[PDB]
Amino acid sequence: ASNFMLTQPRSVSESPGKTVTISCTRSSGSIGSDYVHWYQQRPGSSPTTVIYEDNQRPSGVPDRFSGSIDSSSNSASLTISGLKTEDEADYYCQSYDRSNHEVVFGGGTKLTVLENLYFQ
Amino acid sequence: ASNFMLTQPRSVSESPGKTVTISCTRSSGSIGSDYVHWYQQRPGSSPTTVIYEDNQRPSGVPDRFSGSIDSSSNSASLTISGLKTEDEADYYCQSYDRSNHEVVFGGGTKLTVLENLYF
Amino acid sequence: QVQLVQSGAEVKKPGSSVKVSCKASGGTFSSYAISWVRQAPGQGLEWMGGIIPIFGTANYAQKFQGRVTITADESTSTAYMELRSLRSDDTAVYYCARDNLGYCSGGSCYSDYYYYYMDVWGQGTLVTVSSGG
Amino acid sequence: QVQLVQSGAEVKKPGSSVKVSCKASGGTFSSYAISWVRQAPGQGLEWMGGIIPIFGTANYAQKFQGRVTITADESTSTAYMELRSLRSDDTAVYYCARDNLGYCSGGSCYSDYYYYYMDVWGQGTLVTVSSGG
Amino acid sequence: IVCHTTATSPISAVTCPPGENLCYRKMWCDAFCSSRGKVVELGCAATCPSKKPYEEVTCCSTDKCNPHPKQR
Amino acid sequence: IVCHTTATSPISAVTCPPGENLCYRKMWCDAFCSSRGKVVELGCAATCPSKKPYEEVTCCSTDKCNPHPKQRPG
């Protein structure tokens, strides 16, 4: 039996100062059955926790970061308000599969902060 | 209708450097049914906690202070090793009566440090 | 490092009331309970009751129920003990004292009252009541 | 602060083994689980398994159970991953990562394995497997 | 719907947001269960919250149907 | 009697002191019960420990009769 999957968009790009959301959908089992945690990984660095237990922020993490769960879509989301260039990184959601006794990571999302003033 | 009682000796006296124990006996109900805490009150001062949850020390309290529970005698004890003159104070135990929903204090023990040597 | 600061000593005639205040530094009681504890001269500590502002409820000891009222205003982070029908046995030092274990965290709260150890104490307020009925 | 320091990068022939260390300093060791997580170049994090020294047993991911052994030496506060029969798909950065929630305290321990969020990570160890096999 | 909530100070009754037409009560033990009793979380919800092991979750759909034990 | 205990690292089996002729298991939930299951306390006792609300205690009197959930026989 395979673990459940946590599916995230691979690439998300947004302009500074805006709010961006990154989702993490659990393929089987209820998202509320297991807490979802979120890590930030800057290039060349180890991951750090940005959200734990769905919506809790470790000390030191900017309060522009928040976490939520949506039961209807079976997903967890990381929301970043007031997006800044320093938030560019990869982001991973993580949970646990009780049946197989294994950690499950989402596949990652790269967040890019756009540098263009105008759009085509 | 009455709360249980927590009985402590009224007075304890001992030379410095020695170890003293102050007991607190619960009159009805098991001592282990409710946490016991211990306060120190110096004359003219408010109480401060020296032991909570039977045997935990708050931050800043010297490790010379320890707490224990003896189920067979239905008592809680505060132990002070390496007794110092600054340990002179009144000591109170405290627990809680679930049936009456009240805090219960022991009667207090006055600790005195003896300076002359005795037989 | 919250402190509790009480009002000053008072001397009262029998039958009168006293209302002692206890102001918490920091501008909030959060989900903590505040007790009132008294100590008659040369005697032991005695719990009178307490209040949990976040529930808006107060708990009293039988010895004082019906004569004492304990209140608190979150807006001024001040708690009060009003003791009526004062008599000689009421000459005592009165202390307020915070329950170390808050009643709520993370948006949820405990079900039952249970007075835990008292970490922060006020400085005490001496109330002296003169003789007679 | 608890810190995890890993051994240096290695380059290995196919079919060989690699053993990567993770020395923990600054906290309790026996009671906390350490996981190994790998990340192949430009790919995602993958959990390989972990060890809870106080139970003396390791938990493995099914993908790696046949080839990986995870151990821990209390005497040196060091966890190890040994990965055998290396192939090109094993070229990756290998992290150790400590589970935030310890398994025993105060003389009692939890019932179940449950890998929680990982607060402290090592710096990673790149293992590159050369071609062939 | 108006539901009790433990997210406010003091704990209170709130008009639930749009689409949240249930009140819920979610309880579990923490390390103080043996003295303080269960932890109780009260609030609004769109669907009855999922429960993990050792959690109890009950929902109801009349105003203030989910009081805290001490306001009841 | 020989009992399992959670007073050691790793968890282990110990010969109980004289006069302690029972093994016990005490379990309860903490906030993490929903992920890690019950907290388990194992040891030796002279009399079966008394339980507070929300705690369970069982005692038994054959060797190793009180295993942790991850150390039950097979």
PDB file of C-alpha atoms in Angstrom, chain A residues 8-11 17 48 61 103:
ATOM      1  CA  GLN A   8       1.615  20.968  -4.175  1.00  0.00           C
ATOM      2  CA  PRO A   9       2.064  23.235  -7.260  1.00  0.00           C
ATOM      3  CA  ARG A  10       5.661  23.059  -8.395  1.00  0.00           C
ATOM      4  CA  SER A  11       6.010  26.695  -9.309  1.00  0.00           C
ATOM      5  CA  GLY A  17       3.403  43.154  -1.423  1.00  0.00           C
ATOM      6  CA  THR A  48      13.364  25.229   8.563  1.00  0.00           C
ATOM      7  CA  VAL A  61       8.853  33.334  11.772  1.00  0.00           C
ATOM      8  CA  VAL A 103       6.411  10.671   7.037  1.00  0.00           C
TER       9      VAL A 103
END
